[PDB]
Amino acid sequence: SWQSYVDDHLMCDVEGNHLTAAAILGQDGSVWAQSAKFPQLKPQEIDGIKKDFEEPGFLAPTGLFLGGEKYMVIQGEQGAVIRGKKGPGGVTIKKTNQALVFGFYDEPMTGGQCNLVVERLGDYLIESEL
């Protein structure tokens, strides 16, 4: 289920830590499943995310905003993965055929660990035609 993908795939503990919050949204912005602390995103932020996947580098100059919070854009994967940092922590957003997978992390969890959980789920969803 969508909730299981969040609870059991995204929120799994890695090295004793887990994502602060996670969610799988339809590309329309609707929440398919989310964890307890996932922030409400603004329509314009979802629009920005989609434009950045379509035109790599769009958000880079001024930042990736999520829930009104600024994340410094860091190296991503053109049209597939957006990554950002905010203080000790950060986020990974992975695009699938029909959804957007989000993972927010805070130290001691690392960007690499967040990248793994979020991107591996996204890849499974893609192979599952989702």
Here the tokens at position 95 are: 């695009």
Overall domain count for the chain: 1
Across the beta sheet with 31-34, the strand order is: 31-34, 21-26, 99-105, 89-95, 81-86, 69-77, 64-66
**92: which residues sit within 8 A by CB, 6+ positions away?**
81, 82, 83, 102, 103, 105, 111, 114, 115, 118, 119
Using only C-alpha atoms, what is the Rg of the chain?
A: 13
CB-based contact 79:53 (threshold 8 Å): yes
Segments forming the whole domain that contains residue 127: 1-130
| CATH (domain of 128) | 3.30.450.30
Which residue is associated with the tokens 């991503």?
Answer: 76
Q: What technique solved it?
A: X-ray
What is the DSSP pairing of strand 99-105 with strand 21-26?
Answer: antiparallel
d(CA 108, CA 96): 27
